[PDB]
Amino acid sequence: MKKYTCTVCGYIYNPEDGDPDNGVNPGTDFKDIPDDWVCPACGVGKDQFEEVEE
Ligand SMILES: [Fe+2]
């Protein structure tokens, strides 16, 4: 799974860690995160994130 970054603030979503305090368990691919989740650092929608190509 690839990491995704919030293109508004720079936060990085790492699938190995998830975002558990907001219901995203470690091991969740970004596309499977429920679509109403927002960036935990600035609050913008998932549509402002982009795949980080390794
Ligand atoms: Fe953000």
DSSP letters spanning the chain: ---EEETTT--EE-TTT-BGGGTB-TT--GGGS-TT-B-TTT--BGGGEEE---
> How many angstroms is it from 19 CA to the middle of ligand 1?
13
Experimental method: X-ray
Which one of 3.40.630.30, 2.160.10.10, 2.20.28.10, 3.40.50.720 gives the CATH number of domain 1-54?
Answer: 2.20.28.10
Domain boundaries of the chain, sorted by first residue: 1-54
Degrees, nearest 5: CA angle 28-35-2: 35
In whole angstroms, give the CA distance from residue 53 to residue 50. Answer: 9
> Reported resolution in A?
1.4
In whole angstroms, give the CA distance from residue 13 to residue 27. Answer: 11
Mark the residues whose beta carbon lies below 5 A from ion ligand 1: 6, 8-9, 11, 39, 41-42
- Tokens (6 digits) for 29: 């691919």
Is 14 labelled as part of a ligand binding site? Answer: no
Is 30 labelled as part of a ligand binding site? Answer: no
> How many angstroms is it from 29 CA to the middle of ligand 1?
18
In whole angstroms, give the CA distance from residue 54 to residue 36. Answer: 26
